[PDB]
Amino acid sequence: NQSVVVDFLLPTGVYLNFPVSRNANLSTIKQLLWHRAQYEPLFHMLSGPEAYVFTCINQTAEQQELEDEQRRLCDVQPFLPVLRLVAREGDRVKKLINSQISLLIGKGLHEFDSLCDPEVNDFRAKMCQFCEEAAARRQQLGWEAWLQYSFPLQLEPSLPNRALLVNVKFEGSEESFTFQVSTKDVPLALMACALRKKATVVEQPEDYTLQVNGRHEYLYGSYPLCQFQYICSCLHSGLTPHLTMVHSSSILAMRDESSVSLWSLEQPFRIELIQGSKVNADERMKLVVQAGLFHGNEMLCKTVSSSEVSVCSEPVWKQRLEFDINICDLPRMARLCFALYAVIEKAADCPIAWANLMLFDYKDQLKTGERCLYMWPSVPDEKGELLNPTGTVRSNPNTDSAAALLICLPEVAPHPVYYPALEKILELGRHTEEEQLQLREILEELYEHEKDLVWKLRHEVQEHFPEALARLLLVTKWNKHEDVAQMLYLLCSWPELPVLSALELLDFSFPDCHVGSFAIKSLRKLTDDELFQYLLQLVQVLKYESYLDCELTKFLLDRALANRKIGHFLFWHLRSEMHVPSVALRFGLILEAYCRGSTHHMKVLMKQGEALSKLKALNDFVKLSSQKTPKPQTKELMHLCMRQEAYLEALSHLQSPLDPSTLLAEVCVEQCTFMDSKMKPLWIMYSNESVGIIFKNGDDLRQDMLTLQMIQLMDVLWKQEGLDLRMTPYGCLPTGDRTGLIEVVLRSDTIANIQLNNKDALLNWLKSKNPGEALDRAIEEFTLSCAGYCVATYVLGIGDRHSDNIMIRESGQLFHIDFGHFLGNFKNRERVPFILTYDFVHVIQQGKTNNSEKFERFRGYCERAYTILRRHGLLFLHLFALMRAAGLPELSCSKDIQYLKDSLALGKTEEEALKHFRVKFNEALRESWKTKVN
Amino acid sequence: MYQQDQVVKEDNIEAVGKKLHEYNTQFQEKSREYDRLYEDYTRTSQEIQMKRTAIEAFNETIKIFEEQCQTQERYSKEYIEKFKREGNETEIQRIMHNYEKLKSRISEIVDSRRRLEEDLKKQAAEYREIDKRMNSIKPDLIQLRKTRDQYLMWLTQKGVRQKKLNEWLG
Ligand SMILES: CN1CCC(c2ccccc2CC(C)(C)Nc2nc(N3CCOCC3)nc(-n3c(C(F)F)nc4ccccc43)n2)CC1
């Protein structure tokens, strides 16, 4: 099955048909075609083979000009084996990026055009314009600015004054100069040192830069050497750094490669419900449609219901539903929601489906006319509210087989109506002692008498409690345009709130466009380091947006175009959800806009997506063959599938998606294996100038990413207080439908595998991995890492911790794997207690039955960590509240948020929370002995 | 004066707890069945979209083949006439036979596209029946959840400890 029969269409109309090898590249195929075409008619009229370019229909159903004739036919992957010769004309660069974009984001660009939506076309035109602008400006910036953009500094949060040697090498020279430097030297200072060494065994230091050997990580800036990630890791590990001298000139080579006012329309709001379509329900029941207006999650009037109609595929109502609100009182973000349900005749209510629609379009126009809303199927939940107002306003893309409602907005004016501009809003919004006591009492759900007081002294809230803006936003009555006008008046003059408050304002409870713009305006203070910490939550709240062109998409694209690493992870956060029909349209547009501004990183991402495709096919081969053949003989069947030229070339010489600065060069086929358990994850080893990755297919790795991200956030928050608990914050990255990669920590093994070779194998393994003097250091790393992961797992509610899902590093560092559930969930919910393990307590006590001093130090480590986490509990709460948009099954209601409130004891003072934590620790100590005595 | 709608086997605590176990068992069973159906719903939706974009790719392939036919009918004209007034009718036969081969190839692709069209029609009815089965399962599923919660509240009011409740919910 090595050959494939290919059809060839020549520009003279001649047709040819012969088999070629599936693995030959397009250049070889063209030479073969030219050798056969000379014996076919009209050959004397074609030009040379190099005047033409192959054209095919790719997997995304688009025409593509196959410009890279070094691509194998199996890598091109045409729909049918049909190649057409066409002329080398046109922009060619634009046609190239247009085709590679459709294959990279997993959706054809033509699918956007076919929608015939002006909002889509306006988004693409504006967003792709701005992105191409930023890409063009970046190409003009200096070499130092480009080295910034492509590789931002990887720095520690942050220091003694040590001095150690370093191996500095030059480009293309095996000779390398080793010399000592101080840990507080700026990299320019060490730069000039290697220079005066080179000229005496006459360039200038500020013309060069420093690169880590075997990695796309660079050392520069006005920072001390100790603050760098690679250097700081080199000191604790004991290894001497290995750097490379790079001229600026080598960096440039990388860089080159009509006025009817709405408020005068006092008539009530109404719609015309007409017909349903493609309804599949029980024939004995009746169909009802529920409808209600919403601003965020708040009702704006009563839930006006329709009458019962017999169940059928195309039910007809033709009824008018009138709502208890006037047109002049509908907010800008007024969100009207339907829910079709089946009810037993009056003589177990079943929500069939639901659909939401904005009353104003993206151009601020009140929608009038016929609307066809393709619904989403209703999923049963805990709060069986028929109306689902938190759902997306986007339509179901499955248009040929999904149900829909035909509704009609009535004409209200001869000229169309808009929502008033900001100036017309501020004109409306422009117009004691005892009360200050209750204001402080309330701001330190609300209640009716308290709601009206906060709205009464709204100016006092702005002038004395600015961080309470979110509370004032909720008490505002949005169903009254006068109240709205006054609130937006105060909002347009609110002082700048810290990032913490802005994080809360990004929730779905605050849907006003003015609110989101105020929040984003406060998030602009974020550093790239801090913004990366919340990148995952920021992407998730995009599902909360009502329009395509929004402030948050603007901000995320801004930062992605300014920081290549941020753009890299923004790409994968969106690409890994393109199989979700709710966000495929919005994400695909953002992804296309991002690619047009990052033609360079497009090449890296293309290479990564191809390797991920090969791994999926590889894992599929292993899954199918692991059930019939024992694991020993399945490994070489893997190996045989990997050493294929297409497979080997695709899995080699790429940037890791888990870290774009990590280079995955040569595949160690021999060291590659798999796991003969569930999911059959792959273990892929590499060797550069030795990194591993884990390809897991079958499970959504988003919850595991959030878990590891939250652990990594605790590590940064602790290091900001001078508390280094020797964490192992390895990375986890979902790349597609139940597909992701897991970073591999070298020199690590499970608790179990070490305890199977009385149970002192833990201490003995540490002695054999840290001989003599190194033991003490290893025990200390174990003590700190045990405390931080004990506190982390208790705070996040991660139970089911046993010898299989805890690992040890050869340095003594402990860490966890395979977080199946969090927030107290198990095979059911319940608070996971604080857990101490005697097998571990044996190691902190250095083998002694009683080592009080060491144990009190370990308890101080635990308590200081828990104390620091309590200081940032609002950050964790806000991040989790935004994370509810992700749809994780164990993060969907306020009870999951309440788990973090109780685990961190945010309702109690620091004294009372520390005392209760003391009691929990003590009971965990008492439970650790009873754990293994049985 | 207060006559709330209590619908429980109001009797001994052990009997209500027994039926609490049976209702919770049925609820978890119905939930597993619905989750199986919802998985089939998601897979069928993915496959239907795959077949629909593959239909567009067939459309684009046939479009290119019809462009080739038109290009031939124009480009051939000048030559075909000259070869005739030159005795090269053997080569006219060559051009005409080659163009006939292009025609038959179009018919093959047309046939394969119609086959995928029929597969999509079948899967479209498959999708509609999976959604109908889900819609005939939900009423029970929600009723089973409400009954389980009602028995749980009755037991909680009577003073049953959390341990016995966990025993009945296992
Ligand atoms: C003799 N061989 C040696 C190779 C073993 C092997 C094969 C394939 C995949 C994995 C291994 C490793 C092993 C022990 C089974 N354990 C393991 N190791 C990690 N590592 C991530 C950190 O660095 C350390 C390695 N990660 C997971 N892991 C999985 C799992 F489903 F893949 N899901 C996860 C979800 C979240 C976090 C971690 C997760 N699990 C099989 C026997």
Side-chain angles (χ1 to χ4, degrees), chain A residues 151-174 176-179 181-183 185-197 199-205 207-238 240-271 273-282 284-285 287-299:
Chain A
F151 330 93
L153 294 170
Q154 321 204 219
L155 284 188
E156 289 291 322
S158 80
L159 301 167
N161 40 49
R162 196 144 333 288
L164 199 32
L165 67 137
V166 58
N167 187 328
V168 188
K169 206 206 310 216
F170 275 74
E171 267 218 280
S173 179
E174 308 212 49
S176 47
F177 310 88
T178 70
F179 56 88
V181 279
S182 90
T183 54
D185 272 335
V186 131
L188 181 58
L190 170 155
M191 206 129 60
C193 189
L195 226 45
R196 41 192 164 234
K197 214 151 217 282
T200 63
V201 167
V202 60
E203 225 306 315
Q204 211 261 37
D207 219 15
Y208 287 30
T209 206
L210 286 176
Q211 178 205 336
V212 190
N213 291 17
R215 263 177 63 89
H216 275 137
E217 184 178 341
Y218 292 80
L219 320 186
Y220 55 87
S222 56
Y223 286 96
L225 263 154
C226 75
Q227 265 210 80
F228 291 50
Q229 228 162 60
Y230 174 64
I231 297 332
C232 160
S233 146
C234 271
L235 329 180
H236 258 67
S237 162
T240 61
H242 273 30
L243 303 183
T244 296
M245 222 48 209
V246 181
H247 206 315
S248 43
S249 64
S250 179
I251 304 305
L252 293 294
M254 273 175 161
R255 180 211 68 152
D256 300 331
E257 232 170 305
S258 68
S259 226
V260 185
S261 149
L262 180 105
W263 290 339
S264 59
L265 275 274
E266 298 263 25
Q267 49 266 42
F269 181 75
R270 53 183 40 120
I271 69 90
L273 187 179
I274 313 183
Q275 192 212 166
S277 325
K278 327 206 142 176
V279 193
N280 316 286
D282 217 292
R284 314 152 311 182
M285 314 206 32
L287 287 195
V288 202
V289 173
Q290 303 279 358
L293 290 297
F294 281 82
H295 191 260
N297 37 32
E298 277 326 86
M299 257 168 286

Side-chain angles (χ1 to χ4, degrees), chain A residues 631 673-675 681-683 694 696 701 704 708 730 742-745 748 750 807 815 817-819:
Chain A
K631 148 147 202 192
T673 167
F674 82 102
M675 190 169 96
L682 304 187
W683 176 285
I694 282 165
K696 192 162 162 176
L701 293 191
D704 316 74
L708 288 159
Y730 66 89
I742 303 171
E743 193 192 335
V744 165
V745 199
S748 86
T750 63
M807 313 197 114
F815 64 95
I817 86 172
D818 231 321
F819 318 92

Side-chain angles (χ1 to χ4, degrees), chain A residues 67-117:
Chain A
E67 275 257 353
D68 195 13
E69 316 210 324
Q70 297 300 296
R71 305 279 281 142
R72 310 176 171 68
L73 187 76
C74 56
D75 293 340
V76 181
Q77 278 196 79
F79 187 39
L80 297 164
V82 179
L83 269 38
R84 171 177 181 210
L85 285 181
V86 303
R88 263 153 136 90
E89 54 106 337
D91 186 336
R92 257 184 102 258
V93 207
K94 197 79 154 53
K95 291 183 299 186
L96 180 57
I97 47 171
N98 274 334
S99 284
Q100 307 179 339
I101 277 166
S102 277
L103 281 165
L104 183 72
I105 60 150
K107 174 183 228 49
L109 294 195
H110 78 280
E111 302 191 4
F112 301 136
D113 293 292
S114 318
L115 291 169
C116 302
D117 188 5

Side-chain angles (χ1 to χ4, degrees), chain B residues 121-142:
Chain B
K121 204 196 192 216
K122 257 199 245 206
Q123 203 167 64
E126 247 192 79
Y127 163 89
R128 284 190 75 157
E129 206 66 5
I130 298 332
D131 172 79
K132 189 214 203 54
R133 256 153 65 90
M134 278 178 348
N135 288 335
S136 200
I137 274 190
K138 288 193 237 153
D140 297 345
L141 187 74
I142 321 170

Side-chain angles (χ1 to χ4, degrees), chain A residues 736-755:
Chain A
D737 190 16
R738 304 175 226 110
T739 306
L741 299 173
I742 303 171
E743 193 192 335
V744 165
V745 199
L746 279 167
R747 298 166 236 120
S748 86
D749 202 8
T750 63
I751 288 314
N753 288 348
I754 272 157
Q755 292 195 313

Side-chain angles (χ1 to χ4, degrees), chain A residues 723 725 780 783-784 787 857-865:
Chain A
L723 175 57
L725 295 176
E780 188 65 28
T783 299
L784 307 143
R857 305 217 74 231
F858 163 75
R859 216 215 317 253
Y861 293 155
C862 292
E863 294 179 343
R864 204 185 162 189

